[PDB]
Amino acid sequence: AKITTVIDIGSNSVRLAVFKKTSQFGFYLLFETKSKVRISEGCYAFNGILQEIPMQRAVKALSEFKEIALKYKSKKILCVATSAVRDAPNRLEFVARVKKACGLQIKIIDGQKEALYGGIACANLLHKNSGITIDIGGGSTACALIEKGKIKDLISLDVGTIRIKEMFLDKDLDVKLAKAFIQKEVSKLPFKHKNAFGVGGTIRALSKVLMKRFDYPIDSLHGYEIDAHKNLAFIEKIVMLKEDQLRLLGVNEERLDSIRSGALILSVVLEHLKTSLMITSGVGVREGVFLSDLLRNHYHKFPPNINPSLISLKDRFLPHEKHSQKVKKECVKLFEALSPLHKIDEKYLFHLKIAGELASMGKILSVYLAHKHSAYFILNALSYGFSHQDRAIICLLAQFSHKKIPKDNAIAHMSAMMPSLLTLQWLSFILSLAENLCLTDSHHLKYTLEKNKLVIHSNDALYLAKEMLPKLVKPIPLTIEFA
Amino acid sequence: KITTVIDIGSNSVRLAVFKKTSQFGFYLLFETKSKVRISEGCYAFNGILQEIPMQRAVKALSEFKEIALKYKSKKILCVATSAVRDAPNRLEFVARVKKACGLQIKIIDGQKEALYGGIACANLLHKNSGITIDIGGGSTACALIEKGKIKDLISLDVGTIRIKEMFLDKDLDVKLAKAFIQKEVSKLPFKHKNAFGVGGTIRALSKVLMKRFDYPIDSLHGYEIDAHKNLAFIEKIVMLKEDQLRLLGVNEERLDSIRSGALILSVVLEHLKTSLMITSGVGVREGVFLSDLLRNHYHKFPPNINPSLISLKDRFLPHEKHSQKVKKECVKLFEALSPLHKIDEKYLFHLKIAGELASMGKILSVYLAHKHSAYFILNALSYGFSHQDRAIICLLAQFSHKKIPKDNAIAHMSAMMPSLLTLQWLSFILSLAENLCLTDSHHLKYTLEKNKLVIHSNDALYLAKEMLPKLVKPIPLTIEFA
Numbered sequence: 028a029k030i031t032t033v034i035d036i037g038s039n040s041v042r043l044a045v046f047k048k049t050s051q052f053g054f055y056l057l058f059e060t061k062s063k064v065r066i067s068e069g070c071y072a073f074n075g076i077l078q079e080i081p082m083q084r085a086v087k088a089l090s091e092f093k094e095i096a097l098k099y100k101s102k103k104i105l106c107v108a109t110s111a112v113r114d115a116p117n118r119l120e121f122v123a124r125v126k127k128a129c130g131l132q133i134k135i136i137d138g139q140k141e142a143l144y145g146g147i148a149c150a151n152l153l154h155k156n157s158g159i160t161i162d163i164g165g166g167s168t169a170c171a172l173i174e175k176g177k178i179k180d181l182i183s184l185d186v187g188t189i190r191i192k193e194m195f196l197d198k199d200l201d202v203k204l205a206k207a208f209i210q211k212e213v214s215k216l217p218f219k220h221k222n223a224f225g226v227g228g229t230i231r232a233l234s235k236v237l238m239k240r241f242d243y244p245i246d247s248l249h250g251y252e253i254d255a256h257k258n259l260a261f262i263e264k265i266v267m268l269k270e271d272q273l274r275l276l277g278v279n280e281e282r283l284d285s286i287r288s289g290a291l292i293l294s295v296v297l298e299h300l301k302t303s304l305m306i307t308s309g310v311g312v313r314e315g316v317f318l319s320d321l322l323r324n325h326y327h328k329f330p331p332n333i334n335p336s337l338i339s340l341k342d343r344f345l346p347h348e349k350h351s352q353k354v355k356k357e358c359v360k361l362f363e364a365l366s367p368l369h370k371i372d373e374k375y376l377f378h379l380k381i382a383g384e385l386a387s388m389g390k391i392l393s394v395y396l397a398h399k400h401s402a403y404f405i406l407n408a409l410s411y412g413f414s415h416q417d418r419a420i421i422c423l424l425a426q427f428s429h430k431k432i433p434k435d436n437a438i439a440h441m442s443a444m445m446p447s448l449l450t451l452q453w454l455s456f457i458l459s460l461a462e463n464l465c466l467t468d469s470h471h472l473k474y475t476l477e478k479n480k481l482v483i484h485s486n487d488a489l490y491l492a493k494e495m496l497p498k499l500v501k502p503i504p505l506t507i508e509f510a
Numbered sequence: 511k512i513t514t515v516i517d518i519g520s521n522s523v524r525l526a527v528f529k530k531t532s533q534f535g536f537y538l539l540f541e542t543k544s545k546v547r548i549s550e551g552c553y554a555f556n557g558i559l560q561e562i563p564m565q566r567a568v569k570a571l572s573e574f575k576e577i578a579l580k581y582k583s584k585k586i587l588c589v590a591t592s593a594v595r596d597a598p599n600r601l602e603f604v605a606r607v608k609k610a611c612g613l614q615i616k617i618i619d620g621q622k623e624a625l626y627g628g629i630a631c632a633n634l635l636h637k638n639s640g641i642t643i644d645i646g647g648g649s650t651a652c653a654l655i656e657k658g659k660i661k662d663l664i665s666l667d668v669g670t671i672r673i674k675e676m677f678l679d680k681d682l683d684v685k686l687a688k689a690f691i692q693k694e695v696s697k698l699p700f701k702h703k704n705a706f707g708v709g710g711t712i713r714a715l716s717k718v719l720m721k722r723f724d725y726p727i728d729s730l731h732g733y734e735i736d737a738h739k740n741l742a743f744i745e746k747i748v749m750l751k752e753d754q755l756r757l758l759g760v761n762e763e764r765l766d767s768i769r770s771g772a773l774i775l776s777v778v779l780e781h782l783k784t785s786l787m788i789t790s791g792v793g794v795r796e797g798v799f800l801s802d803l804l805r806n807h808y809h810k811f812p813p814n815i816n817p818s819l820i821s822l823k824d825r826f827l828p829h830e831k832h833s834q835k836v837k838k839e840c841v842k843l844f845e846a847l848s849p850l851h852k853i854d855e856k857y858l859f860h861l862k863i864a865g866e867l868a869s870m871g872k873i874l875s876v877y878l879a880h881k882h883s884a885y886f887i888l889n890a891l892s893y894g895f896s897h898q899d900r901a902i903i904c905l906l907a908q909f910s911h912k913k914i915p916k917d918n919a920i921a922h923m924s925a926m927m928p929s930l931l932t933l934q935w936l937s938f939i940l941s942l943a944e945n946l947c948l949t950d951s952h953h954l955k956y957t958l959e960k961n962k963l964v965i966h967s968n969d970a971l972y973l974a975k976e977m978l979p980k981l982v983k984p985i986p987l988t989i990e991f992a
């Protein structure tokens with residue numbers, strides 16, 4: 028199925044995602060939208076029976092979601108329901124009510140499945156292979172233990188923002204009564220880990236709060252790293268704030284009644300799991316349901332050296348991948364020939380190779396400032412499987428091709444673990460020289476290094492490359508000659 | 511599908527690869543150059559082509575052939591200009607090229623060269639009438655355009671490299687070159703308030719003016735220059751030393767030719783009584799292509815066709831259904847609300863294009879999709895649009911469902927830009943149009959009852975109703991569904 032729509036009927040909101048499959052492993056999120064139905068509204072005081080008005084709202088919203096799915100020419104519609112519907116004595120009635128109204132066939136999924144799908148997404152679409160997911164929802168909280176890309180255990184707890192809200196916070200009971208309740212369920216988590224994968228809207232909201240609190244330069248939620256110990260106190264503080272204080276931190280109006288109880292869950296879980304680093308995730312159950320279908324024969328895992336966002340990016344903007352692969356190859360050969368001089372850690376080949384593939388991607392938009400554009404595409408769309416540093420490095424190499432990288436760059440200094448300015452100049456220089464030598468259809472290039480002289484061997488004239496040699500920015504005094 | 515054009519100029523050899531994405535849709539896929547300068551030292555020998563510049567030219571064009579093939583060109587159009595057409599050994603140099611790489615150079619005369627420039631400026635600029643100024647290495651072409659149709663063609667024998675090696679390399683008084691250029695410019699039989707600057711010299715000078723004023727948009731095409739106001743500065747360029755030119759941003763390879771070129775421009779501008787010069791990023795190369803693409807259309811695009819807008823949609827909006835609906839509702843809401851915002855009907859032009867392209871950037875990422883859209887618009891919506899057009903459309907898309915900041919740089923890029931309250935109105939209308947078009951609902955009808963917009967429809971419009979609070983209204987305004 029080329030175009031696949033995924034509908035997620037949660038306890039707090041109703042969400043829709045349209046996925047487009049560009050190649051075997053290539054895909055990208057084509058369209059997203061939401062509705063704040065909150066089908067669980069007022070149900071926790073009546074044994075989880077879905078009330079009449081929320082069901083009417085859910086039907087009206089799900090009917091237009093079906094319309095949206097069809098105008099995108101969807102070949103497959105996967106619809107799932109979670110905690111609030113799971114627990115509802117009248118779940119069958121609501122499922123059949125939706126089918127009669129718009130045709131959608133809701134598939135109620137158990138709390139373990141809900142946890143599994145989240146783990147599948149994080150294990151394939153994040154830049155770390157080991158850790159525990161934390162998917163705080165309206166009615167339940169899921170956790171999936173992941174070790175080296177494989178899911179080793181799963182837990183589902185019956186604590187949730189709207190559940191805690193309607194049980195304790197709307198009755199204005201002391202928070203310690205709501206805190207105790209959550210701890211009693213969190214104790215049922217049989218694992219610990221230094222890493223955490225933050226999943227769900229509540230955590231995306233708290234992630235935005237911190238991104239604002241630290242003036243983060245990169246405006247991408249997926250991959251955002253959060254020191255758990257340093258911010259644990261700040262997260263608990265959010266619980267006791269009034270509505271006006273939450274607005275000043277950036278919390279949307281529609282999250283004001285739920286984020287307080289949400290922060291409380293997250294703070295109790297972070298303490299129990301002994302987390303020290305939480306990575307914000309932008310994917311969850313929705314993406315998991317899709318990946319479970321996409322990677323049916325590959326054990327729900329991507330083959331090694333297969334990144335979905337890198338591939339789909341080339342599928343969308345580089346259908347003719349021939350030129351970009353030669354540039355990448357020459358980047359490796361030069362990196363090796365020059366290794367005695369630059370002594371750069373081999374780990375940056377990863378970033379240099381990708382920069383070579385994508386250096387000219389931006390030409391699809393304009394040949395002028397093309398590298399600027401490619402750097403723009405990279406920083407904003409190269410998400411799955413890359414850290415924010417990985418984007419920054421890859422971004423800068425392409426951006427400053429044939430140019431000198433300034434010393435006051437905001438992105439280059441986003442962290443102390445970033446490579447030196449000399450390393451970036453070295454890498455970008457290599458990229459630049461490679462682009463010049465691949466301008467023609469030259470083959471069998473060989474490079475040799477002497478004390479300080481790079482010698483380029485080839486049977487071709489390489490007239491243009493030779494003419495363009497002055498306009499390269501060298502990292503150090505260096506001589507370049509053509510045999 | 512893919513057409514390459516090779517321009518054998520007097521100062522440089524140029525290669526451009528064009529991709530045709532539809533009937534009228536095209537975009538420049540790749541470009542490069544070589545500084546062969548085949549005319550080096552030719553003006554002393556009545557135009558004879560020297561050996562070294564010919565061997566360099568052969569080597570370069572042979573690799574321009576290699577490039578054209580690896581881009582899968584079905585057509586390779588090659589033209590030669592002044593320096594090559596004035597030589598006594600033209601036929602021989604053309605033979606060595608065809609021998610060495612298989613290219614068939616077509617020598618074109620001055621009239622033909624002015625035409626190709628006029629064809630490009632007549633189709634790819636945001637003004638319909640004016641005079642082109644194509645200052646090259648050995649000639650200066652001028653075409654008269656009236657309502658997009660070419661009326662007269664003239665070719666002058668003044669050029670950068672020419673004026674350089676005849677006057678400026680010999681360290682004589684500048685007034686001698688000005689007199690020579692004046693006597694040759696007098697041949698121009700027309701005048702006009704609009705001039706279209708073409709060629710690398712003028713692009714280099716425009717780049718200098720942009721830096722001087724700290725311009726916020728980094729696109730050359732469509733840059734407007736006040737001729738009277740900037741004439742004196744252009745004249746001063748002539749008397750500057752190279753180190754002074756470097757601080758102005760002039761690259762090394764233009765240092766030897768920008769002074770003579772500046773002098774030519776100051777005389778042409780003065781003689782044509784030019785009031786507005788529009789920098790053109792397109793020239794002879796684009797004319798050759800448009801001549802082949804618009805062969806059955808009298809070398810001009812229909813007066814409803816923008817090849818930039820189109821190509822931008824061919825590249826990123828193959829399925830055009832949703833966008834056309836949003837545009838339609840943008841017009842209806844605009845007219846229905848006119849008693850409240852009282853905005854000049856000329857701004858419908860922008861709101862409609864913003865409505866077509868508001869969601870374009872979703873092909874890069876659904877997150878921050880509207881910003882991506884603005885980025886595309888501001889950097890690639892070039893042919894047939896002014897910079898203000900770009901700026902306005904860019905801002906409408908960018909700040910959908912948002913409040914436009916008061917200190918926005920693009921909003922203040924000019925004093926003629928619309929007010930912030932106007933931009934807020936258009937952005938708000940776009941936003942409402944987007945919500946009402948989310949589903950496939952039809953037959954929307956609007957009525958205004960003293961600040962009350964009433965949206966009439968038979969469909970539930972559930973989602974549109976729920977999203978209403980997230981709109982940023984430009985003024986206190988009531989909106990209700992019937």
Ligand SMILES: Nc1nc2c(ncn2[C@@H]2O[C@H](COP(=O)(O)OP(=O)(O)O)[C@@H](OP(=O)(O)OP(=O)(O)O)[C@H]2O)c(=O)[nH]1
Binds near residue numbers: 061310
């Ligand atoms: N799943 C997911 N969502 C993302 C990601 N990045 C951003 N979003 C969400 O998409 C919506 C758009 O936020 P922006 O990207 O800043 O675009 P916008 O503000 O101009 O509307 C927001 O949801 P919202 O309107 O604040 O409501 P909510 O969905 O956050 O509860 C935002 O939190 C991501 O990586 N993954």
Ligand SMILES: Nc1nc2c(ncn2[C@@H]2O[C@H](COP(=O)(O)OP(=O)(O)O)[C@@H](OP(=O)(O)OP(=O)(O)O)[C@H]2O)c(=O)[nH]1
Binds near residue numbers: 398543729730761792
């Ligand atoms: N024909 C045309 N050219 C444009 C246009 N816009 C920019 N250019 C030229 O393209 C080349 C790329 O310079 P930039 O656009 O700044 O991109 P870059 O700095 O990263 O190389 C420059 O030519 P250059 O390297 O300075 O040498 P030259 O070709 O200008 O003489 C620039 O003047 C345009 O609209 N039309």
Ligand SMILES: [Mg+2]
Binds near residue numbers: 037109164
């Ligand atoms: Mg959920």
